[PDB]
C-alpha cells in the first residue's frame, strides 16, 4: 500500500521526541484539520472572498505538546 500514501497528504503528521519512558515528551504535530474538539481557530470567511477558479485558502493547524517535569521527593 506504498502507492496509496505517496499520493495522499497526511491528515496528521506527528513527531514525538522523548527520552526513555514516554511520560516526558515533546510533540510537534501538523494537521490539515482542527485537532481540537473544544475550540475552533478562525478560518477565513469564504463569503465575498475567493469564489472563482482560484483555489480556496487553507490554514494548517500546528500544535506543540510540551510539558514541565516536577520532581516529587
Amino acid at each position: 500500500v506504498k502507492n496509496l500514501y505517496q499520493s495522499e497528504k497526511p491528515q496528521k503528521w506527528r513527531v514525538e521526541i522523548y527520552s526513555g519512558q514516554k511520560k516526558i515528551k515533546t510533540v510537534w504535530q501538523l494537521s490539515d484539520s482542527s485537532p481540537i474538539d473544544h475550540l475552533n481557530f478562525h478560518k477565513p470567511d469564504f463569503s465575498e472572498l475567493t469564489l472563482n477558479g482560484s483555489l480556496e485558502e487553507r490554514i494548517f493547524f500546528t500544535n506543540m505538546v510540551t510539558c514541565s517535569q516536577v520532581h516529587f521527593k
Binding site: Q11, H38, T62, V70
Partner: protein
C-alpha cells in the same frame, strides 16, 4: 488548549509529575528544525538522550453521502 498532569511512577511510587502544556497554532506556514526541537527537549527537562518517533494518518476512504452526516455510524 489542554493542560495535562501525568505522574512519574517508579516502582509504583510517585517520584514526580509531568505537567503537560498543549498549545495549538493556526498558520499557513509550517517549518521547524528537528535539531531545535531535540535541543528544547534536552534543555527543558534536562534529559540526556532523544529519540524521535514518527506518526502519520493517511485517510484512505471516507463514506460519502448526499446529505450532511448526522448518523454516528460511518
Amino acid at each position: 488548549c489542554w493542560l495535562g498532569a501525568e505522574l512519574i511512577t517508579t516502582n509504583n511510587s510517585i517520584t514526580g509529575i509531568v505537567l503537560y502544556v498543549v498549545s495549538c497554532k493556526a498558520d499557513k506556514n509550517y517549518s521547524v528544525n528537528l535539531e531545535n526541537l531535540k535541543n528544547l527537549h534536552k534543555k527543558r527537562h534536562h534529559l540526556s538522550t532523544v529519540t524521535s518517533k514518527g506518526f502519520a494518518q493517511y485517510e484512505l476512504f471516507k463514506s460519502s453521502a448526499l446529505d450532511d452526516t448526522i448518523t454516528a455510524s460511518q
